[PDB]
Amino acid sequence: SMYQLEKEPIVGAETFYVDGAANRETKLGKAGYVTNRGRQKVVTLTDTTNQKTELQAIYLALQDSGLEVNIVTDSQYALGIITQWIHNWKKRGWKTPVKNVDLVNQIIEQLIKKEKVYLAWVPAHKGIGGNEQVDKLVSAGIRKV
């Protein structure tokens, strides 16, 4: 492949819980992260979509992290489109996606700069863990929780 994502989390490395949220009626949205070393960032966006904000959040996690990074997302699409891009690069049966192609290409360029990346999906869920904290932050003023 272009790259090999980790098969289990990287012990000792900082973990970024990413999320994004958008509203279809206004195309306003937010993307961000909270980490297990007490970092957080939330950005407000215009002209966006839910899939775009989930991807943007991963982009911020890659931009702001060290060379080894754990990333937990609740977006099956974001995980799938990134993993598929890595697995099929420069190979025969690859047609590049049309939707979000510029943003995914920006993410891949950041990804291959890292030493090790662990990227994993969890279903959205309630509680007081990491995914639930960032979900509240990106949902504020974007939709009812």
Ligand SMILES: COC(=O)c1ccc(OC(=O)c2ccc([N+](=O)[O-])o2)c(OC)c1
């Ligand atoms: C602010 O309104 C929103 O658009 C919004 C979007 C996502 C939210 O939670 C998630 O991250 C999420 C839900 C479903 C998925 N998913 O990947 O199928 O992810 C959310 O929780 C209140 C609100």
Ligand SMILES: [Mn+2]
């Ligand atoms: Mn989400």
Ligand SMILES: [Mn+2]
């Ligand atoms: Mn969420």
Ligand SMILES: [Zn+2]
């Ligand atoms: Zn606009």
Ligand SMILES: [Zn+2]
């Ligand atoms: Zn290292």
